[PDB]
């Protein structure tokens, strides 16, 4: 079988981070979020995954052809020249997967979760109908599309795309298996599958629901990115307690890349991911923060719950908080304070930003 990852056009979400690289290329726990999904797809045994991107990016082509060899499967990349929504990807991929009559995978790129793919294909085989949806129960159904859940059978009574009806607290999980028969139903003109195909497919009752076990989180948006990393480290501690770094001056669940160096007398707090090649000087306390690669954090500085961009230089005595995001090659002067400030790349910062605005 085959698997279609919807990369798509660049989003307004996570925009200061993804001005340099595409959104599926940013390092999430030292791995791109392309990599996590294609990792678990390689464990699933799919020989052909396909990315539907809406603007061609040569660095993305570089990276996919590089990972292509060691991953062991062939990768085809089909390009949307004008965005057809998210339903139109299957319409352009129709001639690319029409040769096999075998149910295929579709994933969103911005979801990070435990991947139950063999249980997914067992659920899809047992229910026997065309469309199988994965869903999850969460906190707030107001950001996602809410479904209705059944008994043992699991047939979806009704699908709603947009909130404020509050029929359940379950949401869509962003990964499905679709049949070759529903791919007849979708036309080639632009529409969106989650809103407009699922809403007429739920009327007959072909759609079924399967609920996720652990730690589903969308990471398209930066404060969702930080809580998704913090939720990833919990299950990573339970699954791989050997990968997580343990130290005398380290508290909580910390993952450090082995290229990274950390000075003494400094307290790395809980749920912190340090990228490959970061230089953390001494006396720096970092909690709930992800530092991307090549970033040098000078001494005596404090950082709680932020994202530090690539090849960045944070000055001394700098306090950052409230998920402040720094772009690629950002210089922060000494003794500044940043609170809620998304910073565009290649810009030095000379003034305190106590109030959460985007900087030039």
């Amino acid at each position: 079988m085959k698997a279609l990852i919807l990369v798509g056009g660049y989003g307004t979400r996570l925009r200061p981070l993804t001005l340099s690289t595409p959104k599926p290329l940013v390092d999430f726990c030292n791995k791109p979020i392309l990599l996590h999904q294609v990792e678990a797809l390689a464990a699933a045994g799919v020989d052909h995954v396909i990315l539907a991107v809406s603007y061609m990016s040569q660095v993305l082509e570089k990276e996919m052809k590089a990972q292509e060899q060691r991953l062991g499967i062939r990768i085809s990349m089909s390009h949307e020249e004008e965005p057809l929504g998210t339903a139109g990807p299957l319409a352009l991929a129709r001639d690319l997967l029409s040769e096999t009559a075998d149910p295929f995978f579709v994933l969103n790129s911005d979801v990070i979760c435990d991947f139950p793919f063999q249980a997914m294909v067992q659920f899809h085989r047992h229910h026997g109908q065309e469309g199988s949806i994965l869903v999850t129960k969460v906190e707030e159904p107001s950001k996602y599309g809410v479904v209705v859940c059944e008994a043992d059978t699991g047939r979806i009574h009704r699908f709603v795309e947009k909130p404020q009806v509050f029929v359940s607290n379950k949401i869509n999980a962003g990964m499905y298996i679709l049949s070759p028969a529903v791919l007849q139903r979708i036309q080639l003109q632009p529409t969106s599958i989650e809103k407009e195909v699922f809403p007429i497919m739920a009327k007959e009752g072909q759609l079924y629901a399967m609920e996720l076990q652990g730690f589903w989180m969308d990471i398209g948006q930066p404060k969702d990115f930080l809580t998704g990393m913090c939720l990833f480290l919990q299950s990573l501690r339970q699954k791989q307690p050997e990968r997580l770094c343990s130290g005398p001056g380290i508290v909580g669940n910390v993952l450090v890349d082995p290229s990274a160096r950390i000075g003494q007398n400094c307290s790395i707090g809980p749920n912190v991911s340090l990228g490959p090649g970061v230089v953390v000087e001494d006396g720096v306390c970092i909690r709930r923060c992800t530092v991307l690669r090549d970033a040098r954090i000078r001494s005596h500085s404090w950082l709680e719950s932020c994202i530090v961009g690539w090849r960045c230089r944070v000055g001394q005595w700098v306090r950052m908080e409230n998920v402040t995001v720094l772009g690629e090659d950002v210089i922060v002067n000494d003794e500044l304070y940043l609170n809620g400030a998304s910073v565009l790349p290649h810009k030095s910062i000379g003034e305190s930003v106590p109030e959460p605005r985007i900087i030039m």
Binding site: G283, C285, H300, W302, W317, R319, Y337, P354
Partner: protein, 406 residues
């Protein structure tokens, strides 16, 4: 023979625009390391023939004030006395009520100094002009902005004879740019017109600027001596910090042993920094410009202090950043904690800008200014205090921003 009268205020009359200290008197507040009236006492003791120094004000004699008098008397080898008014008698009422204590000994002239001014104190230059002309009132005068002059007392003078022709006190409209600096020289005849004002009050309290200066102006009795040096008024917390900066820059000419040297083996010092001998600062700490440290302060490893004033006995732990803030005595700042304030300052484009002071609320909104920590305030670890006034004996547990913490 000359004595000098320092008009320290009372407790109600301070009415602080930002309370620099809740528990110590305002005239004993340490500006640039030493108390605020110790600058007046030292500059008066440098003047030849200074017999005595009197302090008139209606503070009750708490033991801090009397203990300061114990210290100053044996420090400068001058008798320094405290004469307490029975009631708040105004600026010039306390001078008239205590005329027997000032006039005793028959001084040739006597200085009157406001306690809240921070100045050059060119008392010898005023004394030379007074010995030249022997006129009853001599006023120090400074040049100010057209907007800033409405806060002080404006003086219109004859430019040739240096005599006041008109005086007005905090006018609604612009009058003149010269402002009264709160430093005067009084001949012994000058207690005679004050007495006249007292009789008009019977038909107790004499305001010196409004009743004596603003009435006798132009009649040949008041003369202004213009001056050049540094002058500021210590009204609020931010103006106290700016006055401390002015004194630390003035220290190079008079007391080079007071400023901390560069000391590459010890803590880093940029700019003018006063560190007390009893205070122990770790060698990794770096203290930025215009920073005063008090007696018994234990500045920890890795601290950055810029534009601050640390009172006696405060402790700052590791990796803390303190910018534009007054730290009260005995206060504890935990590690990785940041105490920040906003330096309102003075305009950099204005030619003569005098750094106004504003009373805590612009138009019903709290305005950002110097962070005040009260006495024995415990700031916990890894927490941010921003633009705040913290009352004494209060231990915080979370970060506060733009708030008065009761």
């Amino acid at each position: 023979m000359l004595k000098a009268v320092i008009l320290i205020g009372g407790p109600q009359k301070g009415t602080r625009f930002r309370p620099l200290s809740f528990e110590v008197p305002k005239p004993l507040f340490p500006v640039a390391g030493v108390p605020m009236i110790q600058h007046h006492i030292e500059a008066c003791a440098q003047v030849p023939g200074m017999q005595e120094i009197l302090l008139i004000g209606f503070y009750q004699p708490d033991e801090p004030l009397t203990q300061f008098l114990e210290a100053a008397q044996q420090e400068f080898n001058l008798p320094v006395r405290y004469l307490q008014e029975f009631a708040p008698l105004g600026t010039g009422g306390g001078l008239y009520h205590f005329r027997d204590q000032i006039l005793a000994g028959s001084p040739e002239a006597f200085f009157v100094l406001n306690a809240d001014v921070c100045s050059d104190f060119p008392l010898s230059a005023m004394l030379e002009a007074h010995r030249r002309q022997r006129h009853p009132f001599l006023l120090l005068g400074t040049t100010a902005n057209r907007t800033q002059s409405l806060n002080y007392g404006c003086i219109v003078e004859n430019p040739q004879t240096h005599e006041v022709l008109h005086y007005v006190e905090k006018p609604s409209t612009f009058i003149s740019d010269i402002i009264n600096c709160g430093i005067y020289l009084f001949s012994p005849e000058a207690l005679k017109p004050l007495r006249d004002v007292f009789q008009r009050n019977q038909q107790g309290t004499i305001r010196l600027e409004q009743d004596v200066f603003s009435a006798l102006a132009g009649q040949g009795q008041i003369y202004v001596h213009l001056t050049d040096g540094i002058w500021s008024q210590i009204k609020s917390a931010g103006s106290a910090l700016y006055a401390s900066r002015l004194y630390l820059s003035r220290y190079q000419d008079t007391h080079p042993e007071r400023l901390a040297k560069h000391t590459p083996g010890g803590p880093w010092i940029r700019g003018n920094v006063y560190i007390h001998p009893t205070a122990k600062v770790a060698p990794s700490a770096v203290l930025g410009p215009n920073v005063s440290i008090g007696k018994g302060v234990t500045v920890g490893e890795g601290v950055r202090l810029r534009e601050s004033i640390v009172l006696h006995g405060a402790t700052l732990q590791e990796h803390t950043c303190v910018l534009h803030s007054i730290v009260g005595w005995g206060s504890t700042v935990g590690r990785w904690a940041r105490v920040e304030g906003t330096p309102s300052d003075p305009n950099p484009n204005d030619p003569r800008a005098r750094m106004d002071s504003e009373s805590l609320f612009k138009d019903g909104k709290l305005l950002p200014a110097i962070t005040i920590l009260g006495c024995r305030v415990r700031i916990p670890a890894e927490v941010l205090i921003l633009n705040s006034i913290v009352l004494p004996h209060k231990e915080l547990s979370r970060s506060f921003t733009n708030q008065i913490i009761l």
